[PDB]
Amino acid sequence: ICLGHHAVSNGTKVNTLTERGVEVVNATETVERTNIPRICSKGKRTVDLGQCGLLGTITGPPQCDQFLEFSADLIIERREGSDVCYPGKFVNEEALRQILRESGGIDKEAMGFTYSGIRTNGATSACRRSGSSFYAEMKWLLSNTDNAAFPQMTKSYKNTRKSPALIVWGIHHSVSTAEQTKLYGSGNKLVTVGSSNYQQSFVPSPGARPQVNGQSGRIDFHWLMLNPNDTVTFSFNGAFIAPDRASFLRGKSMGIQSGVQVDANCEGDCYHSGGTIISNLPFQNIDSRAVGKCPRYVKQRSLLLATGMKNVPE
Amino acid sequence: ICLGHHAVSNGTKVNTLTERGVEVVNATETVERTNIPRICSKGKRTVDLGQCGLLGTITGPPQCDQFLEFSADLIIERREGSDVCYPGKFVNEEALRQILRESGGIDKEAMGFTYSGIRTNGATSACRRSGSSFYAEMKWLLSNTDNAAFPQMTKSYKNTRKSPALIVWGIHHSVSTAEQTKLYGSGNKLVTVGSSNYQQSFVPSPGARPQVNGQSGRIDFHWLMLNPNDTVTFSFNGAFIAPDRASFLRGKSMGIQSGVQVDANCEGDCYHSGGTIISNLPFQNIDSRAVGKCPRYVKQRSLLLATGMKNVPE
Amino acid sequence: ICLGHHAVSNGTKVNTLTERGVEVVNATETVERTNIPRICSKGKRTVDLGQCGLLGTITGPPQCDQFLEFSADLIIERREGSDVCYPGKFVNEEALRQILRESGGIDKEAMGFTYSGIRTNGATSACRRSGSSFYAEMKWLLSNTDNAAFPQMTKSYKNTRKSPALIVWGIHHSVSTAEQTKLYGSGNKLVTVGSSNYQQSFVPSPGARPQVNGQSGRIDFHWLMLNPNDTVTFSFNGAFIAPDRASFLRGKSMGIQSGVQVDANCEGDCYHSGGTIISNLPFQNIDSRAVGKCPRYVKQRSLLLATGMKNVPE
Amino acid sequence: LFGAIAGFIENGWEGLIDGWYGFRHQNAQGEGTAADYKSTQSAIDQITGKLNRLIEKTNQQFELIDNEFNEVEKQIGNVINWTRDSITEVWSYNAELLVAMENQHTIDLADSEMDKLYERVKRQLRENAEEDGTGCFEIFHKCDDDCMASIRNNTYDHSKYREEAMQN
Amino acid sequence: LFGAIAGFIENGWEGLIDGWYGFRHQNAQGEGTAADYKSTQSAIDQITGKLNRLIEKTNQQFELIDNEFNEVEKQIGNVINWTRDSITEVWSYNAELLVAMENQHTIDLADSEMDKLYERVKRQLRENAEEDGTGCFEIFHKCDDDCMASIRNNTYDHSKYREEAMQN
Amino acid sequence: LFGAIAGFIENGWEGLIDGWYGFRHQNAQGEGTAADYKSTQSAIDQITGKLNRLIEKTNQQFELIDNEFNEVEKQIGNVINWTRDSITEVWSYNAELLVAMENQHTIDLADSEMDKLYERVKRQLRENAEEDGTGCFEIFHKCDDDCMASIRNNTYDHSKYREEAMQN
Numbered sequence A, B, C: 001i002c003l004g005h006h007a008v009s010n011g012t013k014v015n016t017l018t019e020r021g022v023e024v025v026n027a028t029e030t031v032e033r034t035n036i037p038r039i040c041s042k043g044k045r046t047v048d049l050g051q052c053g054l055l056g057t058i059t060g061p062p063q064c065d066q067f068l069e070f071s072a073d074l075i076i077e078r079r080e081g082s083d084v085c086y087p088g089k090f091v092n093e094e095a096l097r098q099i100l101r102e103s104g105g106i107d108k109e110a111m112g113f114t115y116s117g118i119r120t121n122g123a124t125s126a127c128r129r130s131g132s133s134f135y136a137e138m139k140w141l142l143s144n145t146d147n148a149a150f151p152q153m154t155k156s157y158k159n160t161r162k163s164p165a166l167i168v169w170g171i172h173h174s175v176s177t178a179e180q181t182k183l184y185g186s187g188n189k190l191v192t193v194g195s196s197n198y199q200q201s202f203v204p205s206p207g208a209r210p211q212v213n214g215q216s217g218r219i220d221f222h223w224l225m226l227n228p229n230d231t232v233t234f235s236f237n238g239a240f241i242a243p244d245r246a247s248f249l250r251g252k253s254m255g256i257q258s259g260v261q262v263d264a265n266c267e268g269d270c271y272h273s274g275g276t277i278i279s280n281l282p283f284q285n286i287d288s289r290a291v292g293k294c295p296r297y298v299k300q301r302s303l304l305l306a307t308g309m310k311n312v313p314e
Numbered sequence D, E, F: 001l002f003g004a005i006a007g008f009i010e011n012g013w014e015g016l017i018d019g020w021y022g023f024r025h026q027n028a029q030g031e032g033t034a035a036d037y038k039s040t041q042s043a044i045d046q047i048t049g050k051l052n053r054l055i056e057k058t059n060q061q062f063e064l065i066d067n068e069f070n071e072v073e074k075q076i077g078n079v080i081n082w083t084r085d086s087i088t089e090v091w092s093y094n095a096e097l098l099v100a101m102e103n104q105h106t107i108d109l110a111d112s113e114m115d116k117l118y119e120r121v122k123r124q125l126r127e128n129a130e131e132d133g134t135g136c137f138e139i140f141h142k143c144d145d146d147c148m149a150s151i152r153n154n155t156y157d158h159s160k161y162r163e164e165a166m167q168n
């Protein structure tokens, strides 16, 4: 009597500790290469920001009017997105983004700042609605008349909540020293800000910048987080974009940046900019910067795991 | 004749390359879970800062009066700790901490700054000793009278040592533009500072902040390190907290933050906030941020290493 | 008949999963310890900066006169190197270095700034050529006479290229408020700068610093990158070192810091400060901060891989 | 390596589509090829056990620290890239070694199932037959398709057919 | 896997508290169970060698880069967390594979000590006895407790009791 | 471990400079030691295969993120150092385990080449000789240097010299 083992015509070359290109009966892939070119978002509360920028949802330019109080398990930023109508930017902008991405959305609340002896309806043609408007969550404070001084005001807001309050203010940088006075009167303008955690102060900086959205002035956007029972105070005298409402993080979420469509037909957990990686495999060779619940990125295109014995033909 | 192997009634389930839950005769644990809830500090020179903050040991608020020249192999920060009497904070505070934690303690030295045509005994009720006092290693420079100007002074200090000298100065931010003048006279106040390595300058920023310790003014604390034979110069005109003594790192140490007691009865080398990890095991599932000479953190609660053969009963 | 295996007098002790110090017939080393104490640069376009600092190649102090438009596959910084003639430094200096190291060299281009109603030939004895000179790629703008005011000028430059343009400007910090006026007239001097990406502004800060190269004044060097078709504008009124030429990255390179000679006789790809690591071994115990195409650093001095069987003598 | 598959057995049976291991006899009543469940299954259940280890889930979420639409500051940018590449090298190394190690063991345990089958059947037959040396067994007592099926299911009597084959 | 423990040996001797491997005979002079030092010890000294490798020290100190009482700046905060979690995944992976790999080998080397013991005793007895096939040896010459103890300590004569068992 | 080299073979042949494995006989026509290519080569070609795996290239360039002539800012400085040391521990761990694992397998596969050679020669000789038990084979038919060279090259007849050795 004789005994033996099975074999096949064409087997699969694998690599071992000692060999390279040894054919086995059967093998399986370990590295994922198959991508689905859509944001698989089945079962998740999804928010496609589109033209609205993530930081815009706090300040409220026209693009983000529909996102002032959003709520999501999954947040998608888009390339066409924008945090700004009137040209300007955020100091520490990327930290703020990473905060908002995992915030689970935001909840707004009036801070209740009242204004006597100044103007309040500052607007621009860079922020269009009916006509010229402004940031929806902010207020362009101004001198009463078409010139004159600006009283050294002081506003304060206490976070009566159990959660940290996202406070955001703005420094207007006029086109010139002429423009700065026409808006807030002459003199060194100083915006000071403090809390039981924070400590800083701001001066405008008039001067010609190139035109973005049609404007040469800029708006520095700054921010701090107010702890429960802690108070924040705004000592200012001009060149100042006042916060109208504060923000609170709803809960938990994940944030991605992508250029592909949303598909409620498939469920994903590992995302990247070119779609969703659905796989049980321990590794992947698709995107090193993929985020979520993902397999590990590897340089190798393929690593075949033997699922059979040595393959020897006659 | 017949031969065989031993076996036991109840064995231990382990996991293998190919199996999961295979019972062996005996097994041992690989992941550490047993913590001792005290700072095991036997044989080490230990310093419990208690109410004193680490950064306080340089500036010297009343809490840190007993820590102005400490010396340690092991430094313990406490939650109740505080770097400050008069409200304020350090720029680049966390870098400075990491420096002090491994400093092996500090040695102070007079810089010998002399003062003509100004005041020198500035104090506050936030820093109590006999009555109202100030930082012990600093000096609240002031105008001679209850108003008036402040001469553009210039002080300099050369590190005559073989080691880098920790220099620290302070910028007083008055409650108002009225308060700033009452202390240092009117005008734009400017504190400039440079070395053969450093290059910076500072302006105060008066304005109302909330009251901490009973005060609305703040003190910005800044610092730089002076290399051997390098010189530092302080061009200033007011709003300035002068350094009285410089600091030198004694040697080497480790710094931890904890909320548990000190135990000179046990020896530790891997610490975390909830105690000491004494173990020979290669891994641990206790605290991912444990520091010192520690096993590697792993997510797994348990990983049993087989110390015996297969266990098969009749 | 009898069969057996070979053996040797003196074998090699190796370590296994279960043993430690088991002698095998033959073994090979896995950790590299042999260093060659020269920069093996065969086949590569190499540039030894020597006394010129990397950041100097943009500003152009006398040391870097021969490096204003260099081109390299490999860039070597030297300890004696220096970015500066007139004392000063770069803000965000290390980021800029890492940019220049992999730039493959730089290409300069005139920005074409023209000047009416000011002076332009500011120099110093810290930058010697014929006699007192200045940075070759910069321009020390100045008031027409030995005092007087400085017109609020505004210069602009558009990157007409397909690549980002390295823009660099400088803020002169005079020895005193007297010196600042003698150069640029009295008043708060303000240099503002913006683009479709950038947003900032600068004020000088007169005051006494120690003497470096014979001077107590300093020059802050700042920089930004201009994207294709984006424009940058310089709103200024004094205390300002104007850019004469912009810079463009040639391609790709690698940058190292070393203190050993260049050897075109050997080919390297893994470099460190003490020479070149030529090896096929997967690991190394020479320099943890070695850069290029290198084996992995390991703590172990030696790890012997068995290339033979058990060795048992009679 | 146990030296069986691609050892003293020069080929494999491509005709064996029924299982991994089996018997191919040659007596008088014709010819037939079979398959062995307990050997095939034990090896199959071990390879299957390997994939179930490989395929695994993580409740370990990772977030962004980079920005593709708006590049972060260069210094932190390079520290992030440097770190990401460092981890990438580790995982590429791990993945390569794992597969190489697993494949080495997969093959060897398969070869170790051949030899494990063999030697036990060799034990059933006692001195009633002898090893040909090339995976075959030379019997000196003619066994039939009713008797062959009694060796396949481990029921052959290791004595009640012996004395006959002893003289031969 | 060598196919012995949980192979052609269906059970283990729970009565064997004396060692890992041993002999259990059955002649005329009653009955007795023993234990085998050199087999038990060599396997024990190998498992012991594994723990001494596992338990190891590092003069590799690690410091704080985080702050629990005062949270660092968010950007650097997240880069630090991201890095720490990345390393945590590596070490969790390493730890799991190590144990799985070691356990696989521990078991197999234990089974490889049974077969290593067996076949050598089978060699001592020459043709004076034959393999039962289930871990037992059928002798055709009755051995006694003085003779049994001569097989246990590797002193049995592989010829000076042969011719008798040959006829049988 | 297969139990051969440093198993039932107490020593190694230092006189064997010709190869890894070989035969040393003792008949009447004097004496001679040989060497076995196919056993030596297969084991050599496997160890060689291990170094070719170890020695490998990376198109993975790494840059500076530190500065030796001008120390970076302390906060980022320590994050960088902390990260570098974390990776250093991983690679030191990987390197140690790899070598230990490879060495364990290298030794075992070498011992597995001895046993693989042995048992096949034992199969050639059939019942015409018997296992001495210590790596030697006791023949009961005198073989010559022309016949010995026929066992070395796997050409010995497993029957046409049998009946003679059977009576003995």
Ligand SMILES: CC(=O)N[C@@H]1[C@@H](O)[C@H](O[C@@H]2O[C@H](CO)[C@H](O)[C@H](O[C@]3(C(=O)O)C[C@H](O)[C@@H](NC(C)=O)[C@H]([C@H](O)[C@H](O)CO)O3)[C@H]2O)[C@@H](CO)O[C@H]1O
Pocket (backbone or CB within 6 Å): A121, A122, A123, A124, A125, A126, A132, A140, A142, A173, A174, A175, A179, A183, A215, A217
């Ligand atoms: C050569 C000449 O006479 N040209 C004028 C021309 O100035 C004028 O355009 C206006 O230009 C000014 C600057 O000179 C501003 O840019 C005006 O724009 C707005 C804006 O939309 O943002 C108008 C708005 O009412 C302003 N809001 C407030 C609260 O001040 C803002 C604001 O000042 C800036 O945003 C802050 O920097 O400016 C723009 O109308 C045209 C049209 O009037 O007529 C020419 O004769």
Ligand SMILES: CC(=O)N[C@@H]1[C@@H](O)[C@H](O[C@@H]2O[C@H](CO)[C@H](O)[C@H](O[C@]3(C(=O)O)C[C@H](O)[C@@H](NC(C)=O)[C@H]([C@H](O)[C@H](O)CO)O3)[C@H]2O)[C@@H](CO)O[C@H]1O
Pocket (backbone or CB within 6 Å): B121, B122, B123, B124, B125, B126, B132, B140, B142, B173, B174, B175, B179, B183, B215, B217
């Ligand atoms: C409504 C009214 O008249 N109230 C006064 C009230 O102002 C006064 O309290 C004092 O309040 C002032 C500010 O107005 C300061 O806060 C004083 O505090 C000290 C301090 O302890 O820090 C006193 C100390 O002498 C000062 N030191 C120096 C060197 O200046 C400091 C210092 O100015 C600040 O810290 C810098 O901002 O202020 C406090 O006495 C009370 C008691 O006098 O009487 C009411 O009538």
Ligand SMILES: CC(=O)N[C@@H]1[C@@H](O)[C@H](O[C@@H]2O[C@H](CO)[C@H](O)[C@H](O[C@]3(C(=O)O)C[C@H](O)[C@@H](NC(C)=O)[C@H]([C@H](O)[C@H](O)CO)O3)[C@H]2O)[C@@H](CO)O[C@H]1O
Pocket (backbone or CB within 6 Å): C121, C122, C123, C124, C125, C126, C132, C140, C142, C173, C174, C175, C179, C183, C215, C217
């Ligand atoms: C006690 C006394 O009278 N001493 C003078 C002494 O001042 C003078 O030395 C000069 O000192 C001045 C400062 O007072 C500067 O340091 C001069 O140096 C230069 C330089 O080389 O950099 C000269 C140069 O022409 C200047 N360039 C421009 C564009 O201004 C620079 C420039 O001002 C600074 O770099 C900016 O801070 O300064 C130096 O000649 C000596 C020699 O004149 O005579 C004594 O009587």
Ligand SMILES: *[C@@H]1O[C@H](CO)[C@@H](O)[C@H](O)[C@H]1NC(C)=O
Pocket (backbone or CB within 6 Å): A026, A027, A028, A307
């Ligand atoms: C090939 O490999 C995979 C993994 O084991 C398996 O699912 C598939 O059925 C195999 N093909 C064969 C021949 O059964």
Ligand SMILES: *[C@@H]1O[C@H](CO)[C@@H](O)[C@H](O)[C@H]1NC(C)=O
Pocket (backbone or CB within 6 Å): A162, A228, A229
């Ligand atoms: C905050 O202050 C309020 C004052 O009424 C107090 O009731 C509450 O307990 C405080 N909340 C926290 C966070 O302890």
Ligand SMILES: *[C@@H]1O[C@H](CO)[C@@H](O)[C@H](O)[C@H]1NC(C)=O
Pocket (backbone or CB within 6 Å): B026, B027, B028, B307
């Ligand atoms: C169980 O395992 C450990 C590790 O080998 C050992 O110290 C202990 O003695 C074992 N128990 C037995 C059965 O000896």
Ligand SMILES: *[C@@H]1O[C@H](CO)[C@@H](O)[C@H](O)[C@H]1NC(C)=O
Pocket (backbone or CB within 6 Å): B162, B228, B229
């Ligand atoms: C620093 O300067 C002094 C001046 O006396 C000199 O003696 C000493 O050698 C210098 N120290 C160093 C660090 O070289």
Ligand SMILES: *[C@@H]1O[C@H](CO)[C@@H](O)[C@H](O)[C@H]1NC(C)=O
Pocket (backbone or CB within 6 Å): C026, C027, C028, C307
């Ligand atoms: C020792 O080891 C190396 C690696 O296999 C090999 O190149 C060298 O030839 C060996 N020495 C002997 C004994 O051949």
Ligand SMILES: *[C@@H]1O[C@H](CO)[C@@H](O)[C@H](O)[C@H]1NC(C)=O
Pocket (backbone or CB within 6 Å): C162, C228, C229
């Ligand atoms: C930039 O602007 C010019 C204007 O002529 C245009 O032709 C060119 O296509 C633009 N380049 C890019 C980067 O698209």
Ligand SMILES: *[C@@H]1O[C@H](CO)[C@@H](O)[C@H](O)[C@H]1NC(C)=O
Pocket (backbone or CB within 6 Å): D071, D072, D073, D074, D075, D076, D077, D078, D081
């Ligand atoms: C980091 O890597 C990405 C690609 O992964 C590259 O595009 C980017 O330029 C790098 N970041 C920096 C700041 O160099």
Ligand SMILES: *[C@@H]1O[C@H](CO)[C@@H](O)[C@H](O)[C@H]1NC(C)=O
Pocket (backbone or CB within 6 Å): E071, E072, E073, E074, E075, E076, E077, E078, E081
């Ligand atoms: C980093 O992780 C810790 C827990 O390990 C968490 O509490 C903290 O919020 C994280 N840091 C930041 C800045 O998100």
Ligand SMILES: *[C@@H]1O[C@H](CO)[C@@H](O)[C@H](O)[C@H]1NC(C)=O
Pocket (backbone or CB within 6 Å): F071, F072, F073, F074, F075, F076, F077, F078, F081
């Ligand atoms: C980082 O490590 C290097 C040595 O590798 C050391 O010299 C340096 O001081 C460390 N950096 C910081 C900022 O502590």
